[PDB]
PDB file of C-alpha atoms in Angstrom:
ATOM      1  CA  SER A   1     -32.320-113.266 -15.187  1.00 33.03           C
ATOM      2  CA  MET A   2     -29.950-113.255 -17.987  1.00 31.71           C
ATOM      3  CA  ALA A   3     -31.018-115.124 -21.352  1.00 31.94           C
ATOM      4  CA  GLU A   4     -29.561-118.373 -21.298  1.00 31.99           C
ATOM      5  CA  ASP A   5     -30.042-121.878 -23.286  1.00 30.33           C
ATOM      6  CA  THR A   6     -32.560-123.373 -21.477  1.00 27.97           C
ATOM      7  CA  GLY A   7     -33.193-126.590 -23.934  1.00 28.74           C
ATOM      8  CA  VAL A   8     -36.281-124.974 -24.923  1.00 28.10           C
ATOM      9  CA  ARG A   9     -36.241-122.806 -28.095  1.00 29.93           C
ATOM     10  CA  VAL A  10     -38.860-120.049 -28.903  1.00 32.82           C
ATOM     11  CA  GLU A  11     -38.430-118.137 -32.156  1.00 35.46           C
ATOM     12  CA  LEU A  12     -40.274-115.851 -34.796  1.00 34.44           C
ATOM     13  CA  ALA A  13     -42.519-117.807 -37.486  1.00 35.28           C
ATOM     14  CA  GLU A  14     -42.478-114.892 -39.907  1.00 33.59           C
ATOM     15  CA  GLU A  15     -40.706-111.329 -39.868  1.00 34.02           C
ATOM     16  CA  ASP A  16     -41.965-108.714 -37.078  1.00 35.16           C
ATOM     17  CA  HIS A  17     -43.237-105.471 -39.256  1.00 35.31           C
ATOM     18  CA  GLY A  18     -44.000-103.621 -35.934  1.00 36.27           C
ATOM     19  CA  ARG A  19     -47.523-102.370 -37.144  1.00 33.81           C
ATOM     20  CA  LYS A  20     -49.805-104.925 -34.933  1.00 34.98           C
ATOM     21  CA  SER A  21     -50.134-105.962 -31.678  1.00 33.94           C
ATOM     22  CA  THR A  22     -49.517-109.642 -32.411  1.00 35.54           C
ATOM     23  CA  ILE A  23     -46.364-111.806 -33.497  1.00 32.61           C
ATOM     24  CA  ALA A  24     -46.256-115.357 -34.626  1.00 34.24           C
ATOM     25  CA  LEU A  25     -44.014-117.802 -32.665  1.00 33.46           C
ATOM     26  CA  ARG A  26     -42.706-121.294 -32.782  1.00 31.51           C
ATOM     27  CA  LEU A  27     -41.447-123.156 -29.781  1.00 32.18           C
ATOM     28  CA  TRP A  28     -39.507-126.724 -29.906  1.00 30.19           C
ATOM     29  CA  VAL A  29     -37.166-128.629 -27.377  1.00 31.00           C
ATOM     30  CA  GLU A  30     -33.765-128.336 -28.191  1.00 31.62           C
ATOM     31  CA  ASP A  31     -32.213-130.253 -25.203  1.00 29.18           C
ATOM     32  CA  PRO A  32     -34.656-132.982 -23.584  1.00 31.09           C
ATOM     33  CA  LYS A  33     -31.950-133.615 -21.033  1.00 30.78           C
ATOM     34  CA  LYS A  34     -32.868-130.192 -19.289  1.00 28.65           C
ATOM     35  CA  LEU A  35     -36.686-130.954 -18.715  1.00 30.05           C
ATOM     36  CA  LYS A  36     -38.066-133.157 -15.926  1.00 29.95           C
ATOM     37  CA  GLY A  37     -40.535-134.414 -18.302  1.00 27.70           C
ATOM     38  CA  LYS A  38     -39.896-135.616 -21.749  1.00 26.96           C
ATOM     39  CA  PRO A  39     -42.516-134.834 -23.918  1.00 24.62           C
ATOM     40  CA  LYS A  40     -44.151-136.310 -27.273  1.00 17.47           C
ATOM     41  CA  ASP A  41     -42.027-135.147 -30.425  1.00 18.32           C
ATOM     42  CA  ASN A  42     -44.785-133.820 -32.693  1.00 16.03           C
ATOM     43  CA  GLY A  43     -42.731-131.024 -34.025  1.00 16.01           C
ATOM     44  CA  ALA A  44     -42.539-127.126 -33.134  1.00 18.03           C
ATOM     45  CA  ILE A  45     -45.896-125.758 -31.415  1.00 18.41           C
ATOM     46  CA  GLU A  46     -46.808-122.444 -33.407  1.00 15.25           C
ATOM     47  CA  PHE A  47     -48.730-119.845 -31.583  1.00 16.50           C
ATOM     48  CA  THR A  48     -49.716-116.333 -31.882  1.00 14.92           C
ATOM     49  CA  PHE A  49     -48.660-114.009 -29.154  1.00 15.81           C
ATOM     50  CA  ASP A  50     -50.450-110.568 -28.180  1.00 14.80           C
ATOM     51  CA  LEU A  51     -47.621-108.188 -27.007  1.00 15.19           C
ATOM     52  CA  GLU A  52     -50.412-105.737 -25.556  1.00 17.59           C
ATOM     53  CA  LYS A  53     -52.609-108.104 -23.667  1.00 14.60           C
ATOM     54  CA  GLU A  54     -50.754-111.499 -22.911  1.00 15.07           C
ATOM     55  CA  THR A  55     -47.627-112.631 -20.667  1.00 14.44           C
ATOM     56  CA  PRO A  56     -45.255-115.207 -20.920  1.00 14.92           C
ATOM     57  CA  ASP A  57     -46.458-116.987 -17.854  1.00 20.17           C
ATOM     58  CA  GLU A  58     -50.061-117.096 -19.023  1.00 19.40           C
ATOM     59  CA  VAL A  59     -49.170-118.629 -22.373  1.00 20.29           C
ATOM     60  CA  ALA A  60     -46.652-121.124 -20.314  1.00 20.78           C
ATOM     61  CA  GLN A  61     -49.408-122.304 -18.246  1.00 23.21           C
ATOM     62  CA  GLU A  62     -51.794-122.606 -20.945  1.00 24.00           C
ATOM     63  CA  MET A  63     -49.123-125.065 -22.453  1.00 24.18           C
ATOM     64  CA  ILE A  64     -49.162-127.022 -19.229  1.00 23.79           C
ATOM     65  CA  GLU A  65     -53.045-127.192 -19.465  1.00 26.21           C
ATOM     66  CA  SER A  66     -52.959-128.567 -22.756  1.00 26.10           C
ATOM     67  CA  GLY A  67     -50.500-131.478 -21.859  1.00 25.17           C
ATOM     68  CA  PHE A  68     -47.490-130.069 -23.752  1.00 23.50           C
ATOM     69  CA  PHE A  69     -45.217-130.084 -21.135  1.00 27.32           C
ATOM     70  CA  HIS A  70     -44.770-131.441 -17.324  1.00 27.13           C
ATOM     71  CA  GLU A  71     -45.799-128.936 -14.639  1.00 31.51           C
ATOM     72  CA  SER A  72     -42.399-129.167 -12.954  1.00 32.36           C
ATOM     73  CA  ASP A  73     -41.143-127.404 -16.501  1.00 33.63           C
ATOM     74  CA  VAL A  74     -43.657-124.533 -16.435  1.00 33.37           C
ATOM     75  CA  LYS A  75     -40.972-121.938 -15.199  1.00 36.65           C
ATOM     76  CA  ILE A  76     -38.555-123.063 -18.138  1.00 36.61           C
ATOM     77  CA  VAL A  77     -41.224-122.825 -20.728  1.00 36.40           C
ATOM     78  CA  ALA A  78     -41.989-118.944 -19.524  1.00 37.29           C
ATOM     79  CA  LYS A  79     -38.475-118.050 -19.188  1.00 37.55           C
ATOM     80  CA  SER A  80     -37.780-119.156 -22.892  1.00 33.03           C
ATOM     81  CA  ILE A  81     -40.955-117.192 -24.198  1.00 33.30           C
ATOM     82  CA  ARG A  82     -40.037-114.288 -21.978  1.00 31.65           C
ATOM     83  CA  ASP A  83     -36.253-113.960 -23.543  1.00 31.99           C
ATOM     84  CA  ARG A  84     -37.589-114.056 -26.765  1.00 32.34           C
ATOM     85  CA  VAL A  85     -40.441-111.320 -26.549  1.00 32.23           C
ATOM     86  CA  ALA A  86     -37.865-109.037 -24.543  1.00 31.26           C
ATOM     87  CA  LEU A  87     -35.825-109.335 -27.656  1.00 30.72           C
ATOM     88  CA  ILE A  88     -38.808-108.390 -30.198  1.00 31.21           C
ATOM     89  CA  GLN A  89     -39.833-105.288 -27.838  1.00 31.00           C
ATOM     90  CA  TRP A  90     -36.368-104.008 -27.872  1.00 31.29           C
ATOM     91  CA  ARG A  91     -36.119-104.080 -31.537  1.00 32.82           C
ATOM     92  CA  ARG A  92     -39.724-102.350 -31.901  1.00 36.95           C
ATOM     93  CA  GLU A  93     -38.654 -99.489 -29.405  1.00 38.26           C
ATOM     94  CA  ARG A  94     -34.785 -98.942 -29.826  1.00 38.85           C
ATOM     95  CA  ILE A  95     -34.092-100.310 -33.469  1.00 41.99           C
ATOM     96  CA  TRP A  96     -37.291 -99.933 -35.676  1.00 39.01           C
ATOM     97  CA  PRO A  97     -38.069 -96.134 -35.428  1.00 39.68           C
ATOM     98  CA  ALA A  98     -36.671 -93.674 -37.763  1.00 38.50           C
TER      99      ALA A  98
END
């Protein structure tokens, strides 16, 4: 589905140089009214994401298993990661090459 403002932000922690399989990301809650479970506010959740081996759904599920979000918000977390990773991959394939 089209990218949207889900209430959950996912953004780069540093520039993507395109040379490695991993990128460094940060996730935080921008609008808690859009979540069924209201999390503790301990700041951004940092994480490295492997573009070759990992999916947005697996990382979202690991965040549920770690207690960061309510299980009824898993689809919102997964979509927020997916929207950001799709932009990173577009740039690697369609902009970054000479």
